[PDB]
């Protein structure tokens, strides 16, 4: 019955003592942290506490969106040699770092994801030609569905794939997706593999990546400029922001201390130096 | 009144009993006792395999040695029990399964010996690899050493053999082999075998995963990390040694999807 925004217990008055009750002395080897308050070691006063842990609840700690990726698409001229650029991006929280580490304070989590889509666009060729406001379609291609090969193939028809139609110059695009995990919670660390290499099988036939599984395959996001070829090329970037609302977490882990190196837990040489210099006898 | 103490303990699982006189109580991970899979939480339809005493008893691994230059030691579960009597057999023949464990590490010395050992149970102890060229590159064989387990190192060594890479872990001790300061390791259920006080560490771990049951052959749910927090010294000698031993016992052992024998390539 203790809510997140409720006041923490008041610190009460305590005078002098001298007996056989031992608050100060314990043993950490047992694995238990001594749950002491100030009155156990010092003489304190009656104090009506007012502060609350309202701002540190799991909900509140993650109550923010974070740039997860930056996608790049364009609309060049018809006379072009290289094909119009369409972006494909696999849905992961692990391309960026900030959000990842927060998520990584825990081993498992349940949340409904809210995604926002900020879109930028610019001219690239130093000309004086013109472009007409663009519309961008962000289709969600789940694992299994056909992933576009052309900016103009049959996939972009979207009969069952969720797709967003964003007009440039308006409110950034935002959708919601429920807990879509194949497991009962999203796993942030997997201590295993996908395949089991068997004795009577070729090593090649039995290999898989360490810590890699379907637990994390959510398909890709495909985007293009709906507009047809324009005489003067226009570049555009869609910045995606993920907010894990309605969140639940399990098993606390120490936070990443060394800069990340790939989607795994691996680290590289010369990055393994997080702490600076500080002498033992100085403040 | 009767002299009952938290240092003196005896635990019994099956036809095996552990006894000690220098304990520091006992830890039950996250306050949860191991349990059987509930109907409300179940998923595979087939009637499950509950081996009981058959698999659920204490199992002693191969003893290792603690000296001044040891950097640490590690093991994974179930992995570290893969070849232990019935449990292992029951593991190799069923597609899925779940289990808890009571891990008991042993290491006594003298009132003249000193040192502290951090015994940490890390759910999903995904260790770091040895290559700076390719990530998540450690092979199954090297990942799962089984009962012998593995060790931590004090210096990162990137494999530069691009022809036939080593494909193993290179777990740096201070980063608890995962890229996170060992100092925070205490966030995980743990105990400290500080020679002065205690000779053992006992931790009870329930089954922990993102799902009710999983393929124990493909996935390790808990890791066992033991690192000397304080160094091992005795009197005034230069190279002292004290053995460390781990006995592990599954708890509430159950398995489903019985089929033919799994013969994995371990080497």
């Amino acid at each position, epitope marked *: 019955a203790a809510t997140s925004r409720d006041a923490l217990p008041n610190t009460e008055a305590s005078g002098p003592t001298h007996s056989k009750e031992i608050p100060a002395l314990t043993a950490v080897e047992t694995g238990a942290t001594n749950p002491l308050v100030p009155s156990d070691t010092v003489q304190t006063r009656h104090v009506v506490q007012h502060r609350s842990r309202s701002e540190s609840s799991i909900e509140s700690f993650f109550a923010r969106g974070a740039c997860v990726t930056i996608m790049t698409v364009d609309n060049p001229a018809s006379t072009t040699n290289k094909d119009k650029l369409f972006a*494909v991006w696999k849905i992961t929280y692990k391309d960026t770092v900030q959000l990842r580490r927060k998520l990584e304070f825990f081993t498992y989590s349940r949340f409904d994801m809210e995604l926002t889509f900020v879109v930028t666009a610019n001219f690239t060729e130093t000309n004086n030609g013109h472009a007409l406001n663009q519309v961008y379609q962000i289709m969600y291609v789940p694992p299994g569905a*056909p*992933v576009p*090969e052309k900016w103009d193939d049959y996939t972009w028809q979207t009969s069952s794939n969720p797709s967003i139609f964003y007009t440039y110059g308006t409110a950034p695009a935002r959708i919601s997706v429920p807990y879509v995990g194949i497991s009962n919670a999203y796993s942030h660390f997997y201590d295993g593999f996908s395949k089991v290499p068997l004795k009577d099988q070729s090593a090649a036939l039995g*290999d898989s990546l360490y810590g890699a599984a379907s637990l994390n395959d959510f398909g890709i996001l495909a985007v293009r400029v709906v507009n047809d070829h324009n005489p003067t090329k226009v570049t555009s970037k869609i910045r995606v922001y993920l907010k894990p609302k309605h969140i639940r977490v399990w098993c606390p882990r120490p936070p990443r201390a060394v800069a990340y190196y*790939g989607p795994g837990v691996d680290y590289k040489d010369g990055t393994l130096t997080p702490l600076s210099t500080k002498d033992l006898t100085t403040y | 009144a009767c002299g009952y103490s938290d240092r003196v303990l005896q635990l019994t699982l099956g036809n095996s009993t552990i006894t000690t006189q220098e304990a520091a109580n006992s830890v039950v991970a996250y306050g949860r006792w191991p349990e059987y899979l509930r109907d409300s939480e179940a998923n595979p339809v087939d009637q499950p395999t509950e081996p009981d005493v058959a698999a659920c008893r204490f199992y002693t691994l191969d003893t290792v040695s603690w000296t001044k230059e040891s950097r640490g030691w590690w093991w994974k579960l179930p992995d570290a029990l893969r070849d232990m009597g019935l449990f292992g057999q029951n593991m190799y023949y069923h597609y899925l399964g779940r289990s808890g464990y009571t891990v008991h590490v042993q290491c006594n010395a003298s009132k003249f010996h000193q040192g502290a050992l951090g015994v940490f149970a890390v759910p999903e102890m995904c260790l770091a690899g040895d290559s700076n060229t*390719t990530t998540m590159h450690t092979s199954y064989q090297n990942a799962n050493p089984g009962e012998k387990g593995g060790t931590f190192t004090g210096t990162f060594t990137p494999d530069n053999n691009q022809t036939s890479p080593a494909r193993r872990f290179c777990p740096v001790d201070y980063l608890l082999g995962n890229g996170t300061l060992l100092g925070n390791a205490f966030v995980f259920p743990h105990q400290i075998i500080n020679l002065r006080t205690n000779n053992c560490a006992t931790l009870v771990l329930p089954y922990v995963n993102s799902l009710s049951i999983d393929s124990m052959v493909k996935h390790n749910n808990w890791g066992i990390a033991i690192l000397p927090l304080a160094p091992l010294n005795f009197a005034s000698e230069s190279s002292p040694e004290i053995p460390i031993t781990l006995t592990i016992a599954p708890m509430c052992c159950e398995f489903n999807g019985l089929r033919n024998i799994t013969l994995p390539r371990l080497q």
Partner: nanobody
Amino acid sequence: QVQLQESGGGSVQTGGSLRLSCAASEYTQSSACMGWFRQAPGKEREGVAGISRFFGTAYYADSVKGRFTISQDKAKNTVYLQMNSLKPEDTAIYYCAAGQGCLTTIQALGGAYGYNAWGQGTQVTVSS
């Protein structure tokens, strides 16, 4: 699966050009870097070439760089492999390799590990 169907078994002499192709028409989580593996009956199976599904991440085995190149048709869907200046040391059975979720060939970059759909096999002999 995807479709993987390969051909091109021409026993050319030492120093000739050969082209290998593998179908990848259906679009599953499509062959990322793709993959080309040769099995020398003296040795075993080994990875060789590979260009990312969309991106220009093409990895080349130490033994084949420059001479062997990978490229495909992002439409006609088939994967080409230009193998020129052929040594007699490259006489082996080649195979194409679908590495699905692109990250499979981004993490490890090279194939082998993230590869689920296996090709048929074409015998290439480069002799005197």
